[PDB]
Structure 1
Amino acid sequence: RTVARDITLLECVGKGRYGEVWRGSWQGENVAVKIFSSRDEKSWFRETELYNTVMLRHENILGFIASDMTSRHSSTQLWLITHYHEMGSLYDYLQLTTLDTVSCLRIVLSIASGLAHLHIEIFGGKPAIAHRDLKSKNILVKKNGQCCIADLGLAVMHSRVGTKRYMAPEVLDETIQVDCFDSYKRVDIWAFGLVLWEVARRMVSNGIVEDYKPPFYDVVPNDPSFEDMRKVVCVDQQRPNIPNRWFSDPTLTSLAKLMKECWYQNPSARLTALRIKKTLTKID
């Protein structure tokens, strides 16, 4: 049989130190192609190893298609091929979109759903998985209004470091209990609470909305250092601001309480992804 492997790379939709992401075409159909820098080869290996261990299939996890290694003259080319989400990242989407109650809740419940699926061990099944770099740039918006979680290059399985702005206090003060898998789930919950805050700001109530800002925009520089973050989160124990206007709106009042229970200094006090889902299903 003919094994058609040609992919037409059509447009670059992302360039960073990680490498590049392209909109590509396979057999008439959009795919996303991440081309890894040599600097970030271990992210390709880790995601490939995870998918070789468990073929995750979930509506709120970016859909895996292929891992490709090609020999070149004097280098190795590493590609990850996934589903393509033309609306782009949640970070992108929140810059110039505002939300209503239904669309805000749908976004955050879909993220909680994907995260709880990563976190749960299923016997028969899947290992428990922690993401370790959850943030709004690693979430994609689907046309049906739900999101999906992307980038398992730092993920850990039970049975590069995270983005500093989203690091939990125990990561910044190096007290994280690295031999306890639940430690990594609790780091993801902290980061989820920050994402919840980013999204909730863009939800309109009584004709008011906040501008898009990243977590801690008001207390750290762009590209904050590890020390900048440690002083804010660990030493001074700051948390993102909850605007007064949220307390006039029942949805944002509930969401403020939820994000507070993701930001406890004590990791074991934080909500689980399953508890977050249940709470979000009881809002509105």
Structure 2
Amino acid sequence: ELLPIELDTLVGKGRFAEVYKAKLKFETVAVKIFPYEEYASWKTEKDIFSDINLKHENILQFLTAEERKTELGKQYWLITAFHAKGNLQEYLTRHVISWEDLRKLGSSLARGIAHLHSDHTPCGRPKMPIVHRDLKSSNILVKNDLTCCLCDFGLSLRLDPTLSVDDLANSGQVGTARYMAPEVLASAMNLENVESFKQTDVYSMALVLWEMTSRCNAVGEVKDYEPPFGSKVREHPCVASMADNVLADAGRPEIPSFWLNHQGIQMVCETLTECWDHDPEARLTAQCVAERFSEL
């Protein structure tokens, strides 16, 4: 019943699990291992990866889930495709990307998020939208063809109409503080789980598009990679320090005027700027962004 897997190298370590590059006796696969204590996170990701309506080229390919008894107890595994180029944060740290790379990475990221957010399958059938809630460059994988691929669904929320308004309150602010929308940092959301939770994902996507743009040679002179707000906040910033920047100071990652000399870069910058607007209603949808990138 269990797959013939040999773990090779630890390639990732998140809040809930360890990710290993492994040999499947495909040959190279990724194995995400959750201890028994993190069963809930394993189940949450398993439910997304197993959903036939969530199979998409810009969502990490799933092979199978397994329960593996160990001496110390039991581990819960998620076996997926392995992307050798690694996560987007690591990729952008090492590489200066081309305009073509930026277009492919940006468009594929917007397509993946638009698919999660969609209330219908491509064939028109209704489907319950998913909000990622932890969109960031370390949660995006770079495929060999230089397109994006979403992963790390441990904090994702299925926009189920049965969701309690009071239960969503604490819960509290979920995700990574650095990428939290101003309305999340402000504790200013309503139990309108629909367009409102989708808008928080679009804000985080804007910061990621900024990261991709900041490492694109089409801007002219490219600086060393820095995460969003890297020059203003500490390595693991708290919600309070982020609120002081994003909300109180209306701070956003810098877009030097010289970036706008390239027509394509100018279009990407105008788009991501609309997506990180203070007002969630002024933001474009992920589908709008996917359309703007196809126009490029």
TM-score, length of structure 2 as denominator length: 0.89
Q: Conserved in 2, the CA contact under 8 Å of 1:69 and 1:76?
A: yes
Q: Which residue of 1 aligns with 2:137?
A: 136
> Which segment drifts farther, 193-202 or 148-157?
148-157
Residue pair 1:120, 1:128 contacting (<8 A) in 2 also: yes
In the alignment, what sits opposite 1:103? 101
255, 263, 271: which one pairs with 1:242? 255
Match of 1:150 in 2: 151
Q: CA deviation at 1:93?
A: 0.6
Q: Distance in 1 between matches of 2:219 and 2:199?
A: 34
Equivalent residue number for residue 254 of structure 1: 267
Please give the alpha-carbon distance, in whole angstroms, between the structure 2 residues aligned to 1:40 and 1:235: 36
Summarize deviations over 1:107-126 as a string: whole Å, max 9, x none. 10010111111110225363
In structure 2, C-alpha distance between the alignment counterparts of 1:100 and 1:171, rounded to whole Å? 33
Any conservation in 2 of the 1:158–1:181 contact (CA below 8 Å)? yes
Distance 1:51 1:139, change over 3 A: closer
Residue from 226, 229, 236 that aligns with 1:216: 229
Quote the Cα distance in structure 1 between the aligned partners of 2:127 and 2:22. 30
Partner of 1:171, secondary structure, is helix
Partner of 1:13: 11
**Structure 2 match to 1:273:** 286
Residues 136-215 of structure 1: pairs in structure 2 closer than 5 A: 136-158=137-159, 161-205=174-218, 207-215=220-228
Question: Cα–Cα, structure 1 residues 24 and 74, in superposed 2: closer, same or farther, change >3 Å?
Answer: closer
Identity of aligned residues (%): 38
1:68 alignment counterpart? 66
CA distance in 2, matches of 1:219, 1:236: 11
The alpha carbon displacement at 1:40 in A equals: 3.5
Query: 1:258–1:23: structure 2 CA closer, same or farther, 3 Å change rule?
Result: same
Residues 117, 130 of structure 2: 8 Å contact kept? yes
Give the SS at the match of 1:213: coil
What TM-score, normalized to structure 1? Answer: 0.92
> How far off its partner does 1:275 sit?
0.5
The question of 1:80 aligning with 2:78 is answered yes
Structure 1 residues not aligned, in runs of 5+: none
Once residues 215 and 106 of structure 2 are traced to their aligned partners in structure 1, the CA distance between those partners, rounded to angstroms, is: 12
Please, which runs of 5 or more residues in structure 2 have no aligned partner?
Answer: 161-170
Residue 167 of structure 2: aligned partner: none
Paired residues of 2:177 and 2:239 also in contact (CA < 8 A): yes
Q: Which region of structure 1 is more displaced relative to structure 2, 115-124 or 97-106?
A: 115-124
CA deviation vs aligned residue, 1:216-260 (integer Å, no higher than 9, x gap): 112111100110001111111111110122121111111110111
Q: Deviations over 1:134-174 (max 9, x none)?
A: 00000101111111011111111236820110000111111
For residues 124 and 14 of structure 1, what CA distance do their matches in structure 2 show? Answer: 36
Further displaced range: 232-241 or 11-20: 11-20
Distance in 1 (alpha carbons) for counterparts of 2:5 and 2:191: 40
CA distance in structure 1 between the partners assigned to 2:33 and 2:267 by the alignment: 41
